[PDB]
Amino acid sequence: DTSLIRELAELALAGSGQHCHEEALCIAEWLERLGQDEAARLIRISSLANQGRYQEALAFAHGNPWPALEPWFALCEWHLGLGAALDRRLAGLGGSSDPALADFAAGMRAQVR
Amino acid sequence: DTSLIRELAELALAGSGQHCHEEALCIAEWLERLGQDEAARLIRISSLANQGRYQEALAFAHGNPWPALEPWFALCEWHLGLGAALDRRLAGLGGSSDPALADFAAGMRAQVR
């Protein structure tokens, strides 16, 4: 148990991309009870974005404290056609010290802009 | 135990990039006794390439049956200055159905060529 908490979080993430939204959500709520907020937030956002509920996923962007979640908000802005907001977010991520964030930003700008 | 076999393989890989060569090698030999040949081969190659023993790492390229190991041989050819061999290997990997192999090849060609 911690090994199982991690596996349930992984099942929820995998499931959030394969239409298992109710299941993913139950797991995210439980992860929050356990204090695994960043992982719960990732699952919630992935599940909402993968259902096309972009505006609700974007409610979490306000004051977002976890930079690794920023790409999801750029993707939401992209599907909502919010071009200028997308461009500002990508420009911000461009200077990230996390290479994955910086590469995600440069790559999406390149594919999208 | 299988959970521990996987963890030892991960320790060996992490260690192969941080100067723990004797340790990585003992683990690779044991993985081969257990039938985990592809993982043992990965560790052996990473350990040799990270020591700068490029020619010995390249002895495994001959008939290599695991495409995921091909990037290591391109890297070895690169450090040995074997430009034309490198270019042929990258051109071959370019058409791989594994996106990671195809992206590794396109990316290294772009950074190197």
Place this chain on the structure above:
Amino acid sequence: GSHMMTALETRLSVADGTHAAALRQRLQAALAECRRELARGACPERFQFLQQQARALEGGLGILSQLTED
């Protein structure tokens, strides 16, 4: 996705479903303990906690079934 969006899915794409069967058993075992404790009664705080835990476990089993179905 076409090729595994997560590490768990790669683990599960292995020939002998050894990992999937093992994970399913662990989830079922945890869900049964959870239902047994709920059946004994639990205070209200523990009850809401256990119910959320049971639903998370049932959700995990449901996702695992979908990830491994032929």
Place this chain on the structure above:
Amino acid sequence: GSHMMTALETRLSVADGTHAAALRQRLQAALAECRRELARGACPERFQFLQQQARALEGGLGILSQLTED
């Protein structure tokens, strides 16, 4: 590397070395069983097998120490 070349290293970069301590104990436990069985005698085939296993485990402990040293 600057930022973790492997999943295990990320797992180990966590504040409370809960994972590292746990992994170390499992490796030490397996190495002690291995040494106990070697001490009882083992046939020659099993002996070469056990020695390789003990060295793999000792190698794992040595890598873990280097990955987690401050």
Place this chain on the structure above:
Amino acid sequence: MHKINKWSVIYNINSTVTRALRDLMQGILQKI
């Protein structure tokens, strides 16, 4: 348009970008 694709949020996003996204997802899960 009623049949939703798996991982629809990155449908059409290339492998380089999705790989960076996967790297970030795994970094969050490995910290549990």
Place this chain on the structure above:
Amino acid sequence: MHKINKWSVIYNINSTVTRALRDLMQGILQKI
């Protein structure tokens, strides 16, 4: 030149390429 860098084989290789390499390494380890 006697002090060898950690992960010297990819020293100077960019993050996009090393990320693809890590993806392949993890795919091998996850199959154990």
